[PDB]
Amino acid sequence: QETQGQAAARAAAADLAAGQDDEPRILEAPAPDARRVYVNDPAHFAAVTQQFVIDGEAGRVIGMIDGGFLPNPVVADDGSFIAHASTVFSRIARGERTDYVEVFDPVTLLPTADIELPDAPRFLVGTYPWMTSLTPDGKTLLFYQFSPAPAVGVVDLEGKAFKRMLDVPDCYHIFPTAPDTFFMHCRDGSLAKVAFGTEGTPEITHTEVFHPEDEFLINHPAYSQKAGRLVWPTYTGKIHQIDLSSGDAKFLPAVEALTEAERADGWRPGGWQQVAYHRALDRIYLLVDQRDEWRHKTASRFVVVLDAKTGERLAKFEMGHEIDSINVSQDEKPLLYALSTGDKTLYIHDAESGEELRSVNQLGHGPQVITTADMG
Amino acid sequence: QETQGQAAARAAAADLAAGQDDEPRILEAPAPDARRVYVNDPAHFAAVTQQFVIDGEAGRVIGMIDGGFLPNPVVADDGSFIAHASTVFSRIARGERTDYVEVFDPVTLLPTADIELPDAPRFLVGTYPWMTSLTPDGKTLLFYQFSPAPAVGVVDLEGKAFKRMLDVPDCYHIFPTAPDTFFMHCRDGSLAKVAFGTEGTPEITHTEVFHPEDEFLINHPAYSQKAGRLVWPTYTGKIHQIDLSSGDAKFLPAVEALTEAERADGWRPGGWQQVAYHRALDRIYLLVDQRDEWRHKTASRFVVVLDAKTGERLAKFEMGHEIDSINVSQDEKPLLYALSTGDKTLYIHDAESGEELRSVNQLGHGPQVITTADMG
Amino acid sequence: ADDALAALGAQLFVDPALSRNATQSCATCHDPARAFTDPREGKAGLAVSVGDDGQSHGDRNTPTLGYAALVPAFHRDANGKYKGGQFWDGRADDLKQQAGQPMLNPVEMAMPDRAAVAARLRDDPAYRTGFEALFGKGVLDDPERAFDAAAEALAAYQATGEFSPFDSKYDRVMRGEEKFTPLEEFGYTVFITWNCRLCHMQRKQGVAERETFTNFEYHNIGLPVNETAREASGLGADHVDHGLLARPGIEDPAQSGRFKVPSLRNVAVTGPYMHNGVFTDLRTAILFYNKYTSRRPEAKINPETGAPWGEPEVARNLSLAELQSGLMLDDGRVDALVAFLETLTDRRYEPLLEE
Amino acid sequence: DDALAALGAQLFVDPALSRNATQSCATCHDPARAFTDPREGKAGLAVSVGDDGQSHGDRNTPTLGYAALVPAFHRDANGKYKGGQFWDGRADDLKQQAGQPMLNPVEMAMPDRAAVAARLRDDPAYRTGFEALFGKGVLDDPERAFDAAAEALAAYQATGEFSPFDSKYDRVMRGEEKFTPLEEFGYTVFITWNCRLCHMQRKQGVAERETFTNFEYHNIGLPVNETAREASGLGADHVDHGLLARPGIEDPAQSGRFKVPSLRNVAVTGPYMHNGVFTDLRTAILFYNKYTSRRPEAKINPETGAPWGEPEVARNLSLAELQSGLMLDDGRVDALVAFLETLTDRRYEPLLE
Amino acid sequence: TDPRAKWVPQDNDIQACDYWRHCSIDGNICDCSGGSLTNCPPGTKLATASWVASCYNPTDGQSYLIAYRDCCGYNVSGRCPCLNTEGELPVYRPEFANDIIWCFGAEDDAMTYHCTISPIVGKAS
Amino acid sequence: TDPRAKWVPQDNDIQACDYWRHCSIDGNICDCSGGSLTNCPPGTKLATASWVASCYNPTDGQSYLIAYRDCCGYNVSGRCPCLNTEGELPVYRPEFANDIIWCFGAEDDAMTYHCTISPIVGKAS
Numbered sequence A, B: 001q002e003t004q005g006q007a008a009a010r011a012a013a014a015d016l017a018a019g020q021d022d023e024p025r026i027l028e029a030p031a032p033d034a035r036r037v038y039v040n041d042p043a044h045f046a047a048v049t050q051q052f053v054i055d056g057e058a059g060r061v062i063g064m065i066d067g068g069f070l071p072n073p074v075v076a077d078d079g080s081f082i083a084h085a086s087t088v089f090s091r092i093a094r095g096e097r098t099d100y101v102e103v104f105d106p107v108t109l110l111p112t113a114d115i116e117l118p119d120a121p122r123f124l125v126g127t128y129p130w131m132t133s134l135t136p137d138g139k140t141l142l143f144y145q146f147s148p149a150p151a152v153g154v155v156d157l158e159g160k161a162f163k164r165m166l167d168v169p170d171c172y173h174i175f176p177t178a179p180d181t182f183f184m185h186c187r188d189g190s191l192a193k194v195a196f197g198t199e200g201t202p203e204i205t206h207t208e209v210f211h212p213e214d215e216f217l218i219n220h221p222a223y224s225q226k227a228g229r230l231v232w233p234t235y236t237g238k239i240h241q242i243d244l245s246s247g248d249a250k251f252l253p254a255v256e257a258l259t260e261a262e263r264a265d266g267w268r269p270g271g272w273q274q275v276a277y278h279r280a281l282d283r284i285y286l287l288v289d290q291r292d293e294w295r296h297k298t299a300s301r302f303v304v305v306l307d308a309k310t311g312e313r314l315a316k317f318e319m320g321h322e323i324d325s326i327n328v329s330q331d332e333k334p335l336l337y338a339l340s341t342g343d344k345t346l347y348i349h350d351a352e353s354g355e356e357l358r359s360v361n362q363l364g365h366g367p368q369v370i371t372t373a374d375m376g
Numbered sequence C: 001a002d003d004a005l006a007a008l009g010a011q012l013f014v015d016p017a018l019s020r021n022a023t024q025s026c027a028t029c030h031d032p033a034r035a036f037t038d039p040r041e042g043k044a045g046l047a048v049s050v051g052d053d054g055q056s057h058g059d060r061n062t063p064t065l066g067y068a069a070l071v072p073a074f075h076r077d078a079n080g081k082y083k084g085g086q087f088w089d090g091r092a093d094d095l096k097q098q099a100g101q102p103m104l105n106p107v108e109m110a111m112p113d114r115a116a117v118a119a120r121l122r123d124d125p126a127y128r129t130g131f132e133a134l135f136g137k138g139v140l141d142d143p144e145r146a147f148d149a150a151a152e153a154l155a156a157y158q159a160t161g162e163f164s165p166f167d168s169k170y171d172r173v174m175r176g177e178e179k180f181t182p183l184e185e186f187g188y189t190v191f192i193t194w195n196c197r198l199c200h201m202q203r204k205q206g207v208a209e210r211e212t213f214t215n216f217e218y219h220n221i222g223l224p225v226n227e228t229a230r231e232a233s234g235l236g237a238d239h240v241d242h243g244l245l246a247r248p249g250i251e252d253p254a255q256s257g258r259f260k261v262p263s264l265r266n267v268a269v270t271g272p273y274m275h276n277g278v279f280t281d282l283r284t285a286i287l288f289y290n291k292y293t294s295r296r297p298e299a300k301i302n303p304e305t306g307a308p309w310g311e312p313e314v315a316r317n318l319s320l321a322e323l324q325s326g327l328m329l330d331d332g333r334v335d336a337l338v339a340f341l342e343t344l345t346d347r348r349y350e351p352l353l354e355e
Numbered sequence D: 001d002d003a004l005a006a007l008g009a010q011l012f013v014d015p016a017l018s019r020n021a022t023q024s025c026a027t028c029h030d031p032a033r034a035f036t037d038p039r040e041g042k043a044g045l046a047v048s049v050g051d052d053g054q055s056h057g058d059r060n061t062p063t064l065g066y067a068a069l070v071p072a073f074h075r076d077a078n079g080k081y082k083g084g085q086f087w088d089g090r091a092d093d094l095k096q097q098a099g100q101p102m103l104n105p106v107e108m109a110m111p112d113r114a115a116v117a118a119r120l121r122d123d124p125a126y127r128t129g130f131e132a133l134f135g136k137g138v139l140d141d142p143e144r145a146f147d148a149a150a151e152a153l154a155a156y157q158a159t160g161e162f163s164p165f166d167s168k169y170d171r172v173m174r175g176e177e178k179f180t181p182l183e184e185f186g187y188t189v190f191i192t193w194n195c196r197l198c199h200m201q202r203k204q205g206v207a208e209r210e211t212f213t214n215f216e217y218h219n220i221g222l223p224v225n226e227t228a229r230e231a232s233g234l235g236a237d238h239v240d241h242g243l244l245a246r247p248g249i250e251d252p253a254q255s256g257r258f259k260v261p262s263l264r265n266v267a268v269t270g271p272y273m274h275n276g277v278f279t280d281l282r283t284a285i286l287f288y289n290k291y292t293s294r295r296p297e298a299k300i301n302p303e304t305g306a307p308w309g310e311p312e313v314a315r316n317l318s319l320a321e322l323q324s325g326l327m328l329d330d331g332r333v334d335a336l337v338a339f340l341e342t343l344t345d346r347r348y349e350p351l352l353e
Numbered sequence E, F: 001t002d003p004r005a006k007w008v009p010q011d012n013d014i015q016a017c018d019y020w021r022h023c024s025i026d027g028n029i030c031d032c033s034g035g036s037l038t039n040c041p042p043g044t045k046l047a048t049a050s051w052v053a054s055c056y057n058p059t060d061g062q063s064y065l066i067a068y069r070d071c072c073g074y075n076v077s078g079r080c081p082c083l084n085t086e087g088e089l090p091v092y093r094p095e096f097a098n099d100i101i102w103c104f105g106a107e108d109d110a111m112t113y114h115c116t117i118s119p120i121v122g123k124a125s
């Protein structure tokens, strides 16, 4: 009931009445925990951007990180660092391009590494979380290149150096499964497994094709590295699940997030980060609404929750706002994070009852990307 | 009746229907003329910022220029070029600082000079037009430095090179009167004349104190270089006029913009660019409203217009919007430009009847400064 | 008479009596069975054609006559681009100015002069009747009138539906009579979104009424000399083919090494490719464009020789703004573009697509 | 207690506490000069002459006004040393300080505690006064006697008379008068420029009894005072390490740092700094421009027309606070002088001329 | 105005987001920052790459292929933002994908996004 | 609401532009981006320069000098923006002027403006 601005007015007023001194200084953010959540603001393609670091339990901004043009954020699952791949130009948006990776301390937010990526090799695209990805040991960052051809860049975080580009087939996205192995999704409807080394052609192995050429797999699948679970909705809310926990792809039974009657009445997923997965509960969360079929990036006002094993619906929440992206905290009694690009506001919901608990507004110009650590 | 977007749809449909080919290409802006107006957006202190180049007559954006942190725009009165002094950092808002001057061709908008300023010498401040200034011949740009001490930097636009800093006394703003001369306003209430040959210390002479300590002169006076007329309002609307057209300061009769009774009822100027001056008409325009004495930076809904010679009131307009800054085109039947920071919108008015003719919205994040060339 | 002029040109077109030794007609090099191109093997394979003397080889590849009647007469457009004309270097203004040239060229049909061509026309009673009915009595007695008339007839004949039928798969699909396969559709999509559309589409925007997949401009794409063709032509190791700059009256050094953009209709059946016949395979002509974009070592290599593409014959005035697209065609996209270009084959040449 | 201080009042002006009876505390800490030394020696007023008529110190004699407000020497939770007495903090508090001049051979030069006690015991008034407060026989035990004299002197220094809070500044904060325009400008410069980072008690909030020091230790990069170093006889190879010279401080980063002085009475207690190197208050203020200003004159000591000179101790300079990015122009130096003059105690205002 | 409603093209105002050629535009309409329907604004650099869409023209009942091209080398204009996705496919079908910055081939290697133009390049099929 | 009305201070919420200590702030309140009323957010640099104002505190009826110091080296936070100008003077009275970026003295020569803190540094007069 008492707001954070109100509690602070009251504490300042008591220190002034008590004659309590304190030294103005630079704060540290609180230790990273399960209820820490990061919101990135691509700012509708502005040349410079911002990330907000938020305490989900209090609904308070605890820090910010500046970025350049369409940066890719990553968060180590263990809470030990965060990083991004970013792009600047010598005269705002013109002149010499520099692509680079920074690593930051998660409490001081100071950069601890600034690693130049040679020959401007980043993919400049509205931000897809799985276009830049950490290996499970946290030692390597992998980023996608599109131009001149699909390729994956390898950055050694521990030695703070760019290593090499890997040539890959006509494939997209990067789901790391081991210190030297990741998956990609191919134009042909397969996944490719890419096992790499410091030098040498990587070993590239395709899975079976798993979807027809006219089912469309969204740009924001959810992937839980610790579960090895790749959760991939199509435009109709059909959900593909791939188990990569063995190090090889295993195709799980597909589930339908909407019923046949809902589909007949125009229910479809839509937004930006349309899907979330909670590893400990093995639960899938999908943003859906009634919409024409080619309005697939519009906000949605409902979230459906379903059991990943059975596909049984557990809940349908009415969010009460225009929501573009969702994610969840990975602890018990998780939070459901519901980010509105149009309101520039993160709404924080109880994931069990769907009830809005609190919200954090003024999050930049067009915030779209929610990231959390799986520290469990 | 027919908007620019509508006329453009009709011409594109006709080209299509007629089979008319045209090659997609980079447009040139129309020739600079009296009704071209520039609007700078300091973006509420953002690390990067925008300038909008607008055709006032059509109420159409004809181009844009990117800038860095709190840039100072200048525009040559003869239409031959535009330029700014700007500031960038190697990692968005952190790392190595570079201050520089760019000159742009005013129809292609291409930079034709990029002149680095040594030792980060610019004054970083909410944007004041007369903190960076062209000499009447357009061969020199002068910029103000506040740290470590008041100083003025001389930049050779013809040779494309920084020359030197001038040591000045405790003085502010730069009003150029010749290739080698400018005037500043000093803390002690006088003006200083600064004359600089290419070598040595400059020659510095002061006028008499011309206002008392308790009379506050705004950050945004109007200066007409072609008239040599400095129009300086105080917090209450008292208006100072200084004639510099003889190469020396001559003080004109002080004039009151508001009546004794309006002041009594709380009428005061308020805003950002609160004053405009029209050379050929010899006419002063002032932004005014009813306000408390310390709300001097808030928007105003009215403009008063008065004879610079006599000081009689010629009109009072109800602007119908929250207006922060005004300026005027310098041709006959001038436009009165009325920029609203809150609405991010330039309202374009007939300067004689005060009626609103058209407007240009979506001018960035917090647009603040209007500039026009005096071409006649 | 529209029909009759064309019918006269039909007769001339297949008549070898317009060659010095009477071994060669238009149709010898422009063989109707091969989309009007030369199926005959010479010292440089099919890269260049052999003349009436049985020994002289040209230095340029014989182009199709299909769709040549859609090209505008030679002119400089508003943005200073030369456009239109006939020959790889635009040196002829139009079809009519072009026709007389192979007839007097000693490396081709080799007739010594106009009077000699008139003397052959006058020997055939069918030509006396047909020529006089269209151009007046005595036409064939006046070398200049006779020569101009023959060229006029030949130009009329190349303007008939027979040379430009617009009945390729692409045309059927555009009428809604059938559909592209997924591969061809991908190839179409690639062609229209990648740099190909900047030179191999009639218009810069809008839709063309009779698309022939060229903008009729002049570009230097930086091709090497074809050594065996250049050896066969006898022009010498030191010869440079200056393209458009060789057109009389063009003096601008920026025009050096630019050639007319060919129509891609029938491209699948008119190999080998480019102005000197340097590449055998259509795939190889498409892969050539990756030399400007790709970082892979294989992009520097001509897959037909296993050696580097080669130094441009003219290493200046390259169309680098258009060629340096920043994107490599992967093999799936080369496959798609081959599929698509195959749909530009006229119906009667579809049987040739197997070969 | 009133008694204790009354005893210390007697001791403070008594030369019987020096070896040859030529000097008392009041000789060097003259109540007429805000408890500092008026006397001119081999290096001007930079350093004081001891009981022997020849020996000079190496540090300038500081005021005793307000010294009772300084907390006992300690290391705070941010690892900054704070408080204590002497320019280098080598005494914990006023009590530990008072005995040291008595036994210093370059000062009062008593040979030992027993000699001090013998002098106290010869005076009947001291037998009465001391025994009434500390118990009969106190003056017969050299250790008890010496510690009691140190207590009484500390008690005396803690009275209203050394810390009256009656300066113009104090009257203005009580709303009894106003600053002149120039004074008010100097006050604004003081609390918005880098001065207030070291010369205000608290970081933020308002102090009840402000003395214009945070009690911290800083090396501001001052040069040797050449004539004073010569007079001290410590030799040209000597280096004054400041707080590092305090027994038990071992941390190399404390080398060259000195206790921030209270600026009360600063206008009447020249010359300035730990070594009296600058005779004029304006020169003390202008010294700070050396870290900020670009002007050729900022490198030059106005009193000499020669460069300030290299720091005695080149490490541990307080660069973060000193390198403020802003130079004080003449008008701002003028206003600061005016403001600092308002920190003069009422009874010293006639000294201001 | 219902953002989830089926998008309905018009052929009477090119600065509006329901203008028929903008059917798969993502970004800003160049006509609003000094370009035109099919030209870049001064100072910017015209890319050669594009993404395509088949957009129904309610003037003539035909569908035309619009090859969107970006004008690049300037910060995002901020005027007339629009995001439509008629036929728009995920990033693995890039010729139909519109989140990608289509700035390739721009002069001076400009890769920052300013605004998008909407020229017709062909007939739909 | 009424922007031209006499500003009315409150002592109940430090995130609102009417909090009594913000009487001459220009920018953003650091409490809204991970600082606190008198501390800088992580990653930013605390300046030693300030502009100052005498702000009346409605709770105890006293006027305090607030010496506003900037947190520097980040792009502007964009949260809780406020501009008040109680006793604010023109640039030629810089100790009292608030358009100036008071980032002087910040570590690493940081000069970009992120947000402002509102510490009390004394009593007025």
Ligand code: HEC
Residues within 6 Å of the ligand: C013, C024, C025, C026, C027, C028, C029, C030, C049, C050, C051, C052, C058, C060, C061, C062, C063, C064, C065, C068, C085, C086, C087, C088, C089, C095, C098, C099, C100, C102, C103, C107, C108, C109, C154, C260
């Ligand atoms: C010995 C082979 C040979 C014969 C016979 C021949 N040509 Fe050709 N033709 C060519 C070659 C080689 C070129 C390209 C030459 C060049 O560009 O300089 C060409 C080019 C052309 C072109 C230009 C087409 C384009 O796209 O640029 C036309 C039209 C043409 N010939 C028509 C004729 C007609 C009509 C005749 C009979 C009067 C004829 N040709 C006889 C070899 C021949």
Ligand code: HEC
Residues within 6 Å of the ligand: C194, C195, C196, C197, C198, C199, C200, C218, C219, C220, C221, C223, C258, C259, C260, C261, C262, C263, C264, C267, C270, C272, C273, C274, C275, C276, C282, C285, C286, C289, C319, C322, C323, C337
């Ligand atoms: C810069 C203009 C330009 C671009 C872009 C361009 N072409 Fe070409 N194309 C030409 C010109 C000119 C020639 C003839 C070159 C020569 O022979 O000197 C040509 C020749 C060809 C040929 C040989 C046709 C023949 O009859 O010999 C094929 C096939 C071809 N192009 C396909 C493509 C494809 C597919 C693309 C897109 C990958 C493309 N081109 C891009 C201008 C261009």
Ligand code: HEC
Residues within 6 Å of the ligand: D012, D023, D024, D025, D026, D027, D028, D029, D048, D049, D050, D051, D057, D059, D060, D061, D062, D063, D064, D067, D084, D085, D086, D087, D088, D094, D097, D098, D099, D101, D102, D106, D107, D108, D153, D259
């Ligand atoms: C010969 C001159 C001389 C005499 C006599 C003298 N002092 Fe001092 N006093 C000094 C000097 C010099 C210093 C600074 C020495 C240093 O910092 O190392 C000083 C420092 C002090 C300080 C520390 C103040 C501060 O701010 O750090 C106190 C307290 C003090 N003396 C009290 C006394 C008392 C009590 C007596 C009599 C017992 C006395 N002094 C006798 C010269 C004298």
Ligand code: HEC
Residues within 6 Å of the ligand: D193, D194, D195, D196, D197, D198, D199, D217, D218, D219, D220, D222, D258, D259, D260, D261, D262, D263, D266, D269, D271, D272, D273, D274, D275, D281, D284, D285, D288, D318, D321, D322, D336
């Ligand atoms: C980094 C902390 C710091 C800052 C900032 C600072 N001072 Fe000081 N001040 C000192 C210290 C420490 C001394 C004693 C230095 C010494 O003697 O070694 C001192 C000494 C002085 C003295 C001589 C006092 C005496 O009794 O000898 C004056 C006057 C003075 N400072 C004024 C100022 C003014 C005015 C400013 C702002 C322009 C200022 N100082 C800035 C710490 C600081």
Ligand SMILES: [Ca+2]
Residues within 6 Å of the ligand: C037, C061, C062, C063, C270, C271, C272, C273, C274
């Ligand atoms: Ca060929």
Ligand SMILES: [Ca+2]
Residues within 6 Å of the ligand: D036, D060, D061, D062, D269, D270, D271, D272, D273, D276
């Ligand atoms: Ca002194």
